[PDB]
């Protein structure tokens, strides 16, 4: 049981790893769209100018 | 009858008159590349935190 108890945390930790990274991922992806949503407000603002 | 003839202009303005006027909103505060000036800065904002 215990080897059995051990071996699967190993695959347990890596596999959040493996989700940790594709987190990563979509984290700064996302990180970077609302600086596009400050681009397009402004960019309607230059284009609002009269 | 009840009449009413009014101040009716014919403008001779010039450039001048006109070329400021353009400066004052194209340069000036709301300049709208002066927009952009504070848009830089908040890329500039923006990008830093």
């Given at each position: 049981r215990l080897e059995y108890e051990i071996k699967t945390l190993e695959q347990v930790k890596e596999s959040t790893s493996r989700a940790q990274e594709m987190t990563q991922n979509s984290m700064k992806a996302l990180q970077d769209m609302v600086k596009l949503l400050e681009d397009f407000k402004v960019k309607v603002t230059q284009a609002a100018s009269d | 009858s009840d009449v009413n003839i009014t101040s009716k202009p014919i403008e001779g303005k010039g450039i001048f008159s006109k070329l400021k006027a353009t400066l004052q909103e194209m340069?000036?505060?709301?300049?709208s590349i002066t927009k952009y000036d504070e848009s830089l800065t908040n890329d500039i904002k923006s990008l830093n935190t």
């Amino acid at each position: 049981r215990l080897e059995y108890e051990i071996k699967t945390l190993e695959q347990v930790k890596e596999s959040t790893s493996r989700a940790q990274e594709m987190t990563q991922n979509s984290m700064k992806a996302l990180q970077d769209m609302v600086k596009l949503l400050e681009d397009f407000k402004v960019k309607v603002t230059q284009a609002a100018s009269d | 009858s009840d009449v009413n003839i009014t101040s009716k202009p014919i403008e001779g303005k010039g450039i001048f008159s006109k070329l400021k006027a353009t400066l004052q909103e194209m340069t000036g505060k709301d300049g709208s590349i002066t927009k952009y000036d504070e848009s830089l800065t908040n890329d500039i904002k923006s990008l830093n935190t």
